[PDB]
């Protein structure tokens, strides 16, 4: 039950006034998060729609940042000998690392200004 273009028409219509990391656009994007469960691969296409390249690329190092501690540190669902958390958290087996980048996606793009 993946998003269709009109729910992504209402989340960038509505959020269209705010800035990125507002607490507008993260309640917004945060309940989308949760609500309709998506993986890595549909997350990227929701930030390509919403922000520019180069939001695109800060949230992707910050992004690239916050997964670097926290699968260093080591997580109770990673195992670092299959594929990296991106690959992982597209696998609908594998909840807990689709969790966690959800959480890491959110926190990342709440953290540019």
Not at 75 to 83: D, M, S
């Given at each position: 039950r993946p998003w269709q273009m009109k729910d992504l028409q209402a989340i960038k219509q509505e959020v269209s006034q705010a800035a990125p990391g507002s607490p507008q656009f993260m309640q917004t994007i945060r309940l989308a998060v949760q609500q309709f469960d998506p993986t890595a691969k549909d997350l990227q296409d929701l930030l390509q729609y919403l922000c520019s390249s180069l939001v695109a690329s800060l949230h992707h190092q910050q992004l690239d940042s916050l997964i670097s501690e926290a699968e260093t540190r080591g997580?109770?669902?990673?195992?670092?000998?299959?594929?990296p958390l991106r690959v992982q958290a597209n696998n609908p087996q594998q909840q807990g690392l689709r969790r966690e980048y959800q959480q890491l996606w959110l926190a990342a793009f709440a953290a540019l200004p």
């Open positions: 997580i109770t669902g990673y195992n670092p000998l299959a594929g």
